Design a protein around this ligand. Structure first.
Ligand SMILES: CC(C)=CCC/C(C)=C/CC/C(C)=C/CC/C(C)=C/COP(=O)(O)OP(=O)(O)O
Ligand SMILES: [Ca+2]
Ligand SMILES: [Zn+2]
Lengths: 325, 311
């Protein structure tokens, strides 16, 4: 019932040129900009990844970004979102993803990153985001995705990490933040990504979870993150990537979702917003473009459903987890 | 346009200089109340500035060692008030809820009953706020609240109104705790089927009841070694869904559930009807046509295996 109504004049064409122009010019130089500096490293990752998927990575500033990244690695080995901010697993992953896109991993101290990640694992197998101890399956994913890209998944207690993630699996086939937490598409992406990386997708009930995920699709074509919520273009990534991992991507109406995603574009400014007619941002621009790639858009590079990076990049580093057939 | 633009240009400049001041003080090892004053000004509008919650914790830790017992107790009560004011403005910031957990976990005794009430309050505003449900489960475990009490909380909720998935999900975790095991016992399962059947007949829209019912259908041990009572209940549910199908012919949930009940009852005896219902369902829910074809294919193979088990 809760849903958007797409306008008859909503964009129905993919506007790559405008998106590339928008991201290439993002951060020049602004209130919400300023105000989101606490996530800058992830913001940089979102921008670089979407540009690379569109074949426009060259238009970004590699040299500047590599100096920024090195400046954000702390003595503990962890990486912060920005200079002067505190290290965290979120921005450690984002940094490693960026360096992988640029084939510049040894810009940072890899041994120390591995030690940092290792140190955040708890006795039950879970991971804290940082020294202050917040536990979330987001961080289980961040830890194993970071390690996988570095070729160091053996640094953590994998069986215990698996046990923890499976203890977050719910009655409906999905996954939440922590044991007992309600299922949410964002957490399902993290957990199915985790299970892909650790070769445990046989433990997912693909038919049950797949059904729960395809029921995210509302009459508008758009996807929400759990029942009775509004759709959001970023669920085009969270839901679709999960469905792809578990081999059930065809359970979505591809055409209606494509139409919804394109409607979220801003025809004047470029970029995508969470829903049609709202304010655009790099976060939603990445997830709209990546969702379209998962749906098979000709003009966009194929994207890894696990790592949200171009598949050609992961092929290069030889980390391509097997998905459910 | 201009006055609104100029206003946030003023906000920024002050947010920027306060942020600069905090970082300058921290580098200088000045872990003091002013710090606390500066960060309150920033975190008010921007609670997702995680590093600043870290700064507050470092200060509170430092001041613990330097201040008297009751100066320290005063500082924690002020922090609780600050946190609640922050949650009012943005009740979904991970950092804010975690800072509250960090704080309460340190206290040797905290008032857990008060925290459960805070949860009740935020849940009556947004009954789907998962941060708050996560915090409630934290408080419940800390206070050692028994599953039965939390089960009573969910009953009341599901009654008040719809909106609803978060409360059924919680029930799904509580029930196995009350009836623990290395499945639900049938007496429990039957009571749950009655409760959920009430819900989705009271509001056929009510997608959380249908999801939970699908789970209950599979959580039975372990049938068809169906008891006469469960056979009769399921058959009754089947006829009630058919009645609802008449009242609400655009309702896909009731159609899917009719298929699932027939499967639960006797897949081979209901093969004809099952196939008929698949066609009808696909017409009313075309976006799910591929899922429905795969589910039907699965059921057709199950049926071949049952037939070939003849004997
Ligand atoms: C490599 C990538 C892409 C990610 C790294 C791993 C992370 C950090 C994943 C985040 C997953 C997550 C928690 C997504 C949720 C985003 C979202 C739309 C949240 C909103 O949730 P609610 O609080 O339910 O708000 P709504 O009810 O309004 O949807
Ligand atoms: Ca360039
Ligand atoms: Zn979003």
């Amino acid at each position: 019932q809760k849903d958007v109504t797409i306008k008859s004049d909503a964009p129905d064409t993919l506007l790559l040129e405008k998106h590339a122009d928008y991201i290439a010019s993002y951060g020049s130089k602004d209130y919400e900009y300023c105000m989101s500096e606490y996530l800058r490293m992830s913001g940089v990752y979102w921008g670089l990844t979407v540009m690379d998927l569109m074949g426009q990575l060259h238009r970004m500033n590699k040299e500047e970004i590599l100096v920024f990244i090195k400046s954000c690695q702390h003595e503990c080995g962890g990486v912060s979102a920005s200079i002067g901010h505190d290290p965290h697993l979120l921005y450690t992953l984002s940094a490693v993803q960026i360096l992988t896109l640029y084939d510049s991993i040894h810009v940072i101290n890899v041994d120390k990153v591995v030690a940092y990640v290792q140190s955040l694992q708890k006795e039950d197998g879970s991971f804290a985001g940082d020294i202050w101890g917040e536990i979330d399956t987001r961080f289980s994913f961040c830890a194993v995705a970071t390690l996988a890209l570095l070729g160091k998944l053996d640094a953590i207690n994998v069986e215990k990490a698996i046990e923890f993630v499976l203890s977050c699996m719910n009655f409906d086939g999905g996954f939440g933040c922590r044991p007992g937490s309600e299922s949410h598409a964002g957490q399902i992406y993290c957990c199915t990504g985790f299970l892909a990386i650790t070769s445990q997708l046989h433990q997912v009930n693909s038919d049950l979870l797949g059904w729960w995920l395809c029921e995210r699709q509302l009459p508008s074509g758009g996807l929400n993150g759990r029942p009775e919520k509004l759709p959001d273009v970023c669920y085009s990534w969270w839901v679709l990537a999960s469905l792809k991992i578990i081999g059930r991507l065809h359970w979505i109406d591809r055409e209606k979702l494509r139409s919804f995603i394109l409607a979220c574009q801003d025809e004047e400014t470029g970029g995508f917003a969470d829903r049609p007619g709202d304010m655009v941002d790099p976060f939603h621009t990445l997830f709209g473009i990546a969702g379209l790639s998962l749906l098979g858009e000709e003009q966009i590079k194929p994207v890894s459903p696990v790592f949200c990076m171009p598949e050609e990049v992961l092929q290069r580093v030889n980390v391509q987890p097997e998905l459910v057939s | 346009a201009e006055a609104k633009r100029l206003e946030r240009e003023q906000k920024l400049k002050l947010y920027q200089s306060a942020t600069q001041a905090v970082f300058q003080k921290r580098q200088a090892g000045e872990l003091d109340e002013s710090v606390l004053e500066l960060t309150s000004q920033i975190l008010g509008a921007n609670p997702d500035f995680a590093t600043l919650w870290n700064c507050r914790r470092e200060v509170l830790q430092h001041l613990e060692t330097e201040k008297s017992p009751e100066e320290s107790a005063a500082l924690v009560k002020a922090e609780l008030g600050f946190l609640e004011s922050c949650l009012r403005v943005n009740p979904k910031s991970y950092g804010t809820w975690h800072h509250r957990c960090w704080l309460l976990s340190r206290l040797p005794e905290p008032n857990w009953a008060r925290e459960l009430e805070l949860c009740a309050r935020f849940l009556e505003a947004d009954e789907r706020n998962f941060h708050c449900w996560d915090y409630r489960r934290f408080v419940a475990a800390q206070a050692a609240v028994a599953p039965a009490e939390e089960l009573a909380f969910t009953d009341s909720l599901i009654t008040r109104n719809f909106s609803n998935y978060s409360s059924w999900h919680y029930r799904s975790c509580l029930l196995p705790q009350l009836h623990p095991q290395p499945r639900l016992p049938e007496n429990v399962l039957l009571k749950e089927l009655e409760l959920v059947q009430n819900a989705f007949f009271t509001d056929p829209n009510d997608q959380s009841a249908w999801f939970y019912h699908r789970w209950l259908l599979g959580a039975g041990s372990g049938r068809c070694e169906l008891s006469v009572e469960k056979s009769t209940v399921l058959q009754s549910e089947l006829e009630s869904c058919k009645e609802l199908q008449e009242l609400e012919p655009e309702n896909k949930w009731c159609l899917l559930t009719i298929i699932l009940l027939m499967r639960a009852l006797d897949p081979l005896l209901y093969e004809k009807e099952t196939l008929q219902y698949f066609s009808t369902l696909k017409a009313v829910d075309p976006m799910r046509a591929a899922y429905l074809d795969d589910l039907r294919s699965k059921f057709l193979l199950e049926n071949s295996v049952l037939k070939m088990e003849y004997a």
